[PDB]
């Protein structure tokens, strides 16, 4: 299928408690493969998936240097953000960045990203054209002017079209047993009386990868969006994910209800019922 690679940066100030912590995590799809933490005893890029352990010493040296340089760069960004928002140096703030690329089944670039946030709000983002920016406010516009002058977009584009897709294609090949395997959900419906009058039907999906999934209930063929309790897709700890959908149904009306499951590991969508 299609695939993504993303790096997520978090830079967190903490006045009175040393210098801002800088974290990086890298993902292929929903698989974490690399991490860096400036708070680590000896900060370095560390492998988090078997297939990346293949990369040579030079890869780990270069990757570590990027993150080490980033720790300093992002400390400067935090100081600058404080100025741009007329903020005092007593408070703690956060800069985040997501960047990377999506490829199709043939490995061609689908689209690239380079997005930034400050205190959990949009700051600045490379547009899908990979040649212009969207600034969220007048502060980000200052950054925008700087990056337009420095032709940053052009240089991002070069990375996104080249090394981003080149490395992802190599990673996809090296981790082909896992990154190119979808695990379908294991599914069942449980039945829990809530009173004489109502019972909960819970539709479970367990053991699935990647995390993307759709679980819905219908009553007599109609979607029960408003009356369905749907928990956030959650990690199991074994690479796989879990989700459930619950509906409260009138006593005796259980068979009017069907659960519907969409996931890329299923060749076709499943329809589930309570099986007393």
């Amino acid at each position: 299928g299609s695939h993504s690679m993303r790096y997520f940066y978090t830079a967190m100030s903490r006045p009175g408690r040393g210098e801002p912590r800088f974290i990086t995590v890298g993902y292929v799809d929903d698989t974490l493969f690399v991490r860096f933490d400036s708070d680590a005893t000896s900060p370095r890029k560390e492998p988090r998936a078997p297939w990346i352990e293949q990369e040579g010493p030079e890869y780990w040296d270069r990757e570590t240097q990027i993150s080490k340089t980033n720790t300093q760069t992002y400390r400067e960004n935090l100081r600058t953000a404080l100025r741009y928002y007329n903020q005092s140096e007593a408070g703690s703030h956060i800069i985040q960045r997501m960047y990377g690329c999506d490829v199709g089944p043939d490995g061609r670039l689908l689209r690239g990203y380079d997005q930034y946030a400050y205190d959990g709000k949009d700051y600045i983002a490379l547009n899908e054209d990979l040649s212009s920016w969207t600034a969220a406010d007048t502060a980000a516009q200052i950054t925008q002017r700087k990056w337009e002058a420095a032709r940053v977009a052009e240089q991002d584009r070069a990375y996104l079209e080249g090394l981003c897709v080149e490395s992802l294609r190599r990673y996809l090949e090296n981790g082909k047993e896992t990154l190119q395997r979808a695990d379908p959900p294991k599914t069942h419906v449980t039945h829990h009386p809530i009173s004489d009058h109502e019972v909960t039907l819970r539709c479970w999906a367990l053991g699935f990868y990647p995390a993307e999934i759709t679980l819905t209930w219908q009553r007599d063929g109609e979607d029960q969006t408003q009356d369905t309790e749907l928990v956030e897709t959650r990690p199991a700890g074994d690479r796989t994910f879990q989700k459930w959908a619950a509906v409260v149904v009138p006593s005796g009306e259980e068979q009017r209800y069907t659960c519907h499951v969409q996931h890329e590991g299923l060749p076709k969508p499943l329809t589930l019922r309570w099986e007393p």
Binding site: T80, Y99, W147, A150, Q155
Partner: peptide, 9 residues
């Protein structure tokens, strides 16, 4: 693989 390049805010 990460992008080397870093310009500031």
């Amino acid at each position: 693989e990460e992008y080397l390049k870093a310009w500031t805010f």
